[PDB]
Design a protein around this ligand. Sequence first.
Ligand SMILES: Cc1cc(N2CC[C@@](C#N)(C3CC3)C2=O)cc(NC(=O)Cc2ccccc2)n1
Ligand SMILES: Cc1cc(N2CC[C@@](C#N)(C3CC3)C2=O)cc(NC(=O)Cc2ccccc2)n1
Ligand SMILES: O=C(C[C@H]1NCCC[C@@H]1O)Cn1cnc2cc(Br)c(Cl)cc2c1=O
Ligand SMILES: O=C(C[C@H]1NCCC[C@@H]1O)Cn1cnc2cc(Br)c(Cl)cc2c1=O
Ligand SMILES: [Br-]
Ligand SMILES: [Br-]
Ligand SMILES: [Br-]
Ligand SMILES: [Br-]
Ligand SMILES: [Cl-]
Ligand SMILES: [Cl-]
Ligand SMILES: [Cl-]
Ligand SMILES: [Zn+2]
Ligand SMILES: [Zn+2]
Lengths: 491, 485
Amino acid sequence: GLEATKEDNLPDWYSQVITKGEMIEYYDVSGCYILRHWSFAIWKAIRNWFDAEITRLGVKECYFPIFVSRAALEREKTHIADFAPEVAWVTKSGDSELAEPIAVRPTSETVMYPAYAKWIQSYRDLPIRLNQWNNVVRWEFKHPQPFLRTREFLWQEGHTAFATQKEADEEVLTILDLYAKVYTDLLAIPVVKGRKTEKEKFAGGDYTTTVEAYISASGRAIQGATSHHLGQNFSRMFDIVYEHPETKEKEYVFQNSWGITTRTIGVMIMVHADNQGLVLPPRVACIQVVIVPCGITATTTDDERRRLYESCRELEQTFVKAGIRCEGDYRDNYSPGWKYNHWELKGVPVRIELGFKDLQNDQFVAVRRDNGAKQTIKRAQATVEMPKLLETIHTSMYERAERDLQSHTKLTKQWAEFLQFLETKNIIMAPFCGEISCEDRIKAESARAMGAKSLCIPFEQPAKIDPKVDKCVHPACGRVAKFYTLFGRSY
Amino acid sequence: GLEATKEDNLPDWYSQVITKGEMIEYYDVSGCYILRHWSFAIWKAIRNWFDAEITRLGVKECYFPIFVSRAALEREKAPEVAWVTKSGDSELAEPIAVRPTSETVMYPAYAKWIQSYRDLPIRLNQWNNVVRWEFKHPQPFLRTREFLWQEGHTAFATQKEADEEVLTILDLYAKVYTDLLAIPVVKGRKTEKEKFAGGDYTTTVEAYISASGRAIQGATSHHLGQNFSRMFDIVYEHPETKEKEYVFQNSWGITTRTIGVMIMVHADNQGLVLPPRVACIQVVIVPCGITATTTDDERRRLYESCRELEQTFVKAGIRCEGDYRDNYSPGWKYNHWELKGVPVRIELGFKDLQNDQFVAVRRDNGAKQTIKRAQATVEMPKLLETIHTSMYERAERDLQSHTKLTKQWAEFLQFLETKNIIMAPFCGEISCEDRIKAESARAMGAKSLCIPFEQPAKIDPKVDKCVHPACGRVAKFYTLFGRSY
Ligand SMILES: Cc1cc(N2CC[C@@](C#N)(C3CC3)C2=O)cc(NC(=O)Cc2ccccc2)n1
Ligand SMILES: Cc1cc(N2CC[C@@](C#N)(C3CC3)C2=O)cc(NC(=O)Cc2ccccc2)n1
Ligand SMILES: O=C(C[C@H]1NCCC[C@@H]1O)Cn1cnc2cc(Br)c(Cl)cc2c1=O
Ligand SMILES: O=C(C[C@H]1NCCC[C@@H]1O)Cn1cnc2cc(Br)c(Cl)cc2c1=O
Ligand SMILES: [Br-]
Ligand SMILES: [Br-]
Ligand SMILES: [Br-]
Ligand SMILES: [Br-]
Ligand SMILES: [Cl-]
Ligand SMILES: [Cl-]
Ligand SMILES: [Cl-]
Ligand SMILES: [Zn+2]
Ligand SMILES: [Zn+2]
């Protein structure tokens, strides 16, 4: 059983959910966590779905080295802030100090783009569309949290180069829509699509698009994935050029990069798990249905205790043959109540209870993990009804979370409401001038990590800004509002 | 085109095959290489096949961290591990190591997860990257500082379960080589000198590179017995009598070395030759007969017919692509896809179109065969099987041609200098093996490759003795020896 509640002590409840749910094992290297099989399976489902999508689009998979040279890391950088990256440095091999230290990759721009330059010998080599499924390392000295913010993490990073800007812009949005679908269609999590402000975009790119999710327990937002248009910034840095076929001049390609991580799993937990443990979205759950025989007594029999099991096994096999990931729990040394708790902790979407009674009556009881409701299904209907049920669960889980998100997304034009909404765990849609210094003042004034940050400029604007009358929300700015921006406390 | 020959200058030829075959890009950190998509697709076929296999056996996938603490590493009881000592410009309180293998990462977790008898067995696998920072000469795919692999770690209540699993995994590795890669291998047990020092015995599959004349370990599957469980206190209490029991453990691994062996065995002086079951593209269609007088409607017509055939192949599960580029001649495309090793090239011109046929050319043979279009879906798979069989059988002939059996040291050395591997009676002593290696160099001394599961004859204890003239001992078994990588 869980020993903390999502409302009273979120970090404790989260630690208990990931350990008692057998997702994570803690490690003696801080900021790094063991992914047990139960959570790695969810990553597998996410990874395979996304890879199939981008493969169908024409991206191809490759693998570049974990180590980056110091020369490549520092390439073409001239400002002093650029020269002390927080990368992990390998300085020796056994007892031999190395000639030149080499860095663990925090991301792979620096080692892929020299190769892109070599590989693009003419305009006919374009586009180049590659992706890696790999592990990167960012050794920051802040508070790490499993899944959400770790020093080593698994991800995919796609790096694309095109002859025209139009191609690249289109791809930025196609990839962002895939990431949105990861959250909504696989994980039943609503997200907000938008552009980062100038303050929050990737500094090496032209613009950054994002999907943001909302953690109602803390009232905080978290960036779920990212999709950048780099424009020509890196092509000019790394001389990724080709000769124009018509004008014959040297032209720089247009690039994107895009990435998503195991943070997905963290968001799933933070949004869906409850005070009894995990609640797995049906489409990624390793096991969707567990069958628990019950009604066995001390004097049930032995020759009947096996009959009940036989019927449970028959139903299990039917489910598996219908494409439903199902298992039976026939362990004799654990009570049915124990098994109930154990599989609720692991968040299996449907528990089946099957007792002698219901065997007698051609039926069984299906129990939804997300809301606890029980339903009697005639065995003849198992194959028809159980898929429908799993779809319903996904939909309830999504719509539940969506209503949460919308009821805590508050539109206002008034600074006082901005502050009040922020202290009551909302995120806020407000007219915004877009300026970096104004964003700084908004953050500094809203602090009581408690200052509000911009989350994204949402593609779906809640209303149309009137450039003629609408001003920025902050009382001391006074500039024309360029758009509505989403603000909140950012995880 | 390739500018070295496999039989004259093997390393230059190898480098030209992996670069012009678009497998590898060289890289400014020595001993690490970029895997382009053409080679990574091969690793992916191997990896997905092996994973489906062990998943059906009930092994489950997990992922452990790439960093190992110094204490953890030191529990194993000098090693060329890569040490992280700084983050940015802050020196770390304690240096952490890049995993060279995950025993010291995983087995503490195992000791914790095994709380009672009912938790056994534990059978976990990871697909990950490991680092071994050796200063010896590296070679792409074959010996690298960073490599991709899978490492499996299992724990059982009894030794016999574990012995069986060792053999099961070894058999899968053999199948990767023979069935996926068309490479014959010799299953065997390592000698006491060559086994993994931390286990009880090591099993292996050994392959032979005829060009080099050298043998190479293609995979490994260890029985660790109780060594590691005693080291890491991986215990349970026996349910009746409640004595403390140490679990029995195995580990097993295979790497991108597979791809290296593939090249070394099958590639030729025109480039790669991909075994059909791992080739990312199996069939490539090249449109032929386009003159400078070929009009644009006729070019559209030929391309659309090629694309129709291409998609008919893809729908029937044959991985086929068409090369519809107009800046490259048909002959250029022939050379290009030959360098890349695509098993079948289809040549489809206008005469072919009018006769409802095409020509399929085998990359391995060069042999051409005309096929009526209606029979495409039925003949093309057969051919692909034929290619696999040819490739395997060619390699197996080449391996048995280079496998020699003797009982006399003189013939043994004559064979070693003729680029052969030699089966000889052996006592199995470490000192004697050292002596055998020492008295064959003028590394080019003779090392033991494996004690083969399938012996060439019965080492009669009353008659047969060790092959070295200075060992007086009775021969325990026939051991396969040779020069190795
Ligand atoms: C698990 C995970 C995820 C992510 N990030 C980043 C943005 C992104 C998004 N969206 C990536 C583009 C895809 C994401 O998920 C980042 C991280 N570690 C870190 O920042 C390093 C760290 C370690 C300890 C404490 C503080 C910081 N750890
Ligand atoms: C690509 C690859 C493979 C393998 N090894 C090992 C044995 C094994 C087998 N069998 C593994 C158990 C599965 C194997 O494949 C090993 C390696 N690097 C190294 O030794 C590091 C190194 C670096 C430069 C020069 C010399 C040595 N690199
Ligand atoms: O990592 C990025 C940009 C993009 N890379 C491709 C996948 C998607 C991803 O958002 C931004 N970023 C983030 N963190 C970093 C940390 C360090 Br340390 C360095 Cl050197 C560089 C970076 C750095 O470039
Ligand atoms: O890595 C092994 C033993 C097995 N681990 C699991 C997968 C299969 C593999 O053969 C042997 N080995 C090989 N090379 C090593 C290099 C270093 Br450096 C260290 Cl510390 C340790 C080792 C080390 O333990
Ligand atoms: Br950034
Ligand atoms: Br990032
Ligand atoms: Br070893
Ligand atoms: Br090894
Ligand atoms: Cl696990
Ligand atoms: Cl590409
Ligand atoms: Cl590539
Ligand atoms: Zn403003
Ligand atoms: Zn001897």
